[PDB]
Amino acid sequence: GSSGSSGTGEKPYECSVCGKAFSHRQSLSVHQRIHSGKKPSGPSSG
Ligand SMILES: [Zn+2]
């Protein structure tokens, strides 16, 4: 078939917890930080 895209972004470093991409590993680490104690069980509770 035909799609029209040969993945022009894929990188050796891509986050999973949130699903992001980066060029260097160091850039991926500092990013994962955003996922620090920021995962509440429920959005609207209590
Ligand atoms: Zn992430």
Distance CA 46, CA 17 (A): 26
Residues with CB under 5 A from ligand 1 (ion): 15, 17-18, 20
Residue from 10, 12, 15 nearest 31 by CA: 15
CA–CA distance, 22 with 30 (Å, rounded to integer): 11
Q: How far is the CA of 41 from the centre of ligand 1 (A)?
A: 18
What was the elucidation method? NMR
Q: Taking the C-alpha atoms of 25, 28, 33 and 37 in order, what is their torsion angle to the nearest 10 degrees? A: -110
CATH of domain 11-46: 3.30.160.60
